[PDB]
Amino acid sequence: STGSATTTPIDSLDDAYITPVQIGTPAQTLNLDFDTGSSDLWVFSSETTASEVDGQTIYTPSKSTTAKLLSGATWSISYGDGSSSSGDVYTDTVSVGGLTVTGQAVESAKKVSSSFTEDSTIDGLLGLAFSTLNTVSPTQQKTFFDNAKASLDSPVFTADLGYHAPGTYNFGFIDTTAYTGSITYTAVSTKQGFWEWTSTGYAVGSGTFKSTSIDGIADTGTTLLYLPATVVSAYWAQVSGAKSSSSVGGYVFPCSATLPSFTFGVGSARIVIPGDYIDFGPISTGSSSCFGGIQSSAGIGINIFGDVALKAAFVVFNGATTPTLGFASK
């Protein structure tokens, strides 16, 4: 089997991407944030505290003939941005882009934190990291990908995120028309439950490439590119007037600037992030200070190749017995 679904930016900044997902019988379509940095499929629901729902589409398990309470199971998750959610669990039929899994754990939110409430466009998350990170207790549950894997034509999914435009998540096949040149594959460590890999270095603009190992995760659920402070300082030093602002919470730059590109290494290959991808716009409405898309990972404990980086590439998440990651230009 295979599946193919379009993923769409939630706003003009590409702050996140949403992908329609069919849950239950008859189908209830919710727009979920596909997150390769976590491993829970959770949704706003008929169980979500009413004051914490503001415009989202909800899953109502009582209206699904295939929903079953997973008795005794609860879940609770915190994300890197300080957001969180928790609740109980159903199993139900879940389809993405024509690919169907029966018996998928669908985690129903009883509580969500304010950032989720305030984002009317995201109806939940669909985790695509390794199932060892799944938070369901007392019986950990599998991700949609892990449940689908054995049925897939090939045990892979791909992320092809757009810059200010829709893109695609494919399951079970590599669309050879969706990228240019060749795909360079690189080793993955699953020891922390993430798609963790080692970039071979970077360049800023037209500058020389610096060969240096940068361990990080491929995380579709993080907006920005978080890299070591040395690397980030070297980037922003090339932008007149750029500075790290403790009050704003990171690097800012004059909105009048033209940003340089940023290149990262994948083995001997190179992925170039155009400068425009690194512009996250005014820090507040009407401001001439703009927020940068490359920020320091200091204090995170790991580097994060979030959407800013991933959307510059066609990315293969190879879930074979020994997982790997592939990157191609596009």
Ligand SMILES: O=C(NNC1=NCCC1)c1ccc(Br)cc1
């Ligand atoms: O939470 C993480 N990724 N997903 C999402 N973030 C916000 C909503 C979804 C995340 C994962 C690993 C590390 Br290290 C830091 C952050």
